[PDB]
Ligand SMILES: [Cl-]
Ligand SMILES: [Cl-]
Ligand SMILES: [Cl-]
């Protein structure tokens with residue numbers, strides 16, 4: 001063995017890397033994270049950190065050969081999709097900046113990034129209202145397709161000079177705990193979503209998979225300390241487990257449009273009526289301005 | 291971070307695993323090794339260990355979910371291809387048996403396995419005649435293809451119930467040192483061969499790549515202790531670096547047919563003449579029998 005590792009064993013580059021509010025294992029050959037783990041709470045998702053002051057850039061700790069660069073993504077037909085969201089790190093400028101390191105980024109469909117995936121990230125943030133602590137493992141997937149002749153093929157695009165791997169699917173393992181003193185099994189949900197436009201019709205539960213099925217597909221073992229026979233319980237069994245629909249989501253966007261200059265506030269309300277337009281909290285903001 | 295890894299970070303399953311005469315890093319999602327490192331010498335490739343007493347079987351140390359089984363390979367149209375060869379472990383029954391663990395095996399083209407790849411393994415064994423110590427890193431690759439429209443796609447087949455990944459290419463990093471007291475840079479050669487029939491016409495040097503180019507494609511850093519600016523020298527610059535041709539190879543097979551019962555030895559010589567048939571060492575064996 002001393003003869004065998006005389007000049008050292010090859011470097012896989014898959015060791016866990018820690019950041020302020022997220023940890024990850026990088027995939028040196030695909031130039032994408034393999035998994036990204038974060039902890040989120042009521043407090044962490046509140047703060048003055050601003051997404052606008054952040055810039056996407058290679059992770060300084062990754063060898064430049066195995067790193068992706070913005071040139072790989074810009075003009076590819078694919079977006080720079082965060083795995084650990086910027087929006088879960090309002091409490092810390094450092095933490096938010098570190099989620100803009102390309103080591104947390106994956107070539108994600110533009111519509112999925114701002115649509116379905118966004119609503120899943122929003123649902124994870126919502127859970128902090130009902131669970132004191134939420135844990136999330138996010139990451140890419142290159143799943144096979146079975147042709148008519150019975151053959152199973154893994155087919156994915158590589159973008160840029162660096163051949164950044166475009167996944168077919170994205171996963172999220174949501175682990176949620178009520179309080180520190182709770183003795184009830186922790187709520188777990190595993191979801192696999194295709195890297196394409198999805199819309200509002202499909203329910204999040206349509207994309208649910210078993211933890212074992214996700215582990216088999218991804219080659220990973222999530223939250224190894226949890227005893228699968230006593231510590232885990234389906235999140236759907238103990239939570240509404242629903243994303244915001246078209247009406248709830250467009251209302252959420254319009255409420256955020258209520259903050260920014262002029263009497264443009266009349267134009268926002270005219271657009272909502274042109275079928276949604278209600279909500280009580282909405283008015284306690286569409287008055288506190290004018 | 292204590293909050294973040296409360297239930298542990300996900301398990302990648304990519305840690306180095308040591309065996310008697312080989313080490314490897316497994317790819318839990320593809321069910322194939324990522325790299326396999328071995329040390330070979332004049333002595334190790336000599337012994338009474340017999341390939342016939344060995345059986346292909348899942349590696350006992352791999353979680354069965356991430357392991358491949360013979361059922362995945364048998365009937366797939368692909369062979370069980372050793373990365374660390376059985377033939378490099380004649381000195382040890384244990385060592386040879388451990389190279390039959392599916393953790394060392396890759397779905398390899400039947401012809402490449404017995405043809406070109408076999409001759410590369412033979413060339414590695416030959417180097418022990420000229421270098422006291424030879425180190426070898428072997429492994430699979432899924433490289434992209436550029437379509438006519440400019441798009442780069444990684445396309446590979448998955449075989450069996452377990453979806454064992456069929457590589458497009460196979461690599462070998464050959465590290466060779468003259469003696470323990472030598473101060474000359476070590477001889478290095480990196481080669482990438484497609485997972486298909488190749489034949490005798492292509493020279494091994496047609497498949498040579500730079501170490502840096504292999505590292506970029508594979509996402510690995512080979513022999514990290516070697517200073518690339520002072521310790522390494524192209525193997526082609528200091529070695530014949532040639533595989534056995536059709537005549538040398540068929541003669542080598544016939545010499546091995548000289549060991550096994552009857553006066554079938556006349557039939558072997560008749561087949562050689564039917565254009566090759568010479569060699570001096572050959573006769574010192576085709577007499578020591580009859
Ligand atoms: Cl983008
Ligand atoms: Cl969508
Ligand atoms: Cl076979």
Ligand SMILES: [Cl-]
Pocket residue numbers: 401402405406407486487488489
């Ligand atoms: Cl061949």
Ligand SMILES: [Mg+2]
Pocket residue numbers: 081082113114117118
């Ligand atoms: Mg996003």
Ligand SMILES: [Mg+2]
Pocket residue numbers: 371372403404407408
């Ligand atoms: Mg072989």
Ligand code: NA
Pocket residue numbers: 071072073074075076159160161
């Ligand atoms: Na590009």
Ligand code: NA
Pocket residue numbers: 361362363364365366449450451
């Ligand atoms: Na099969």
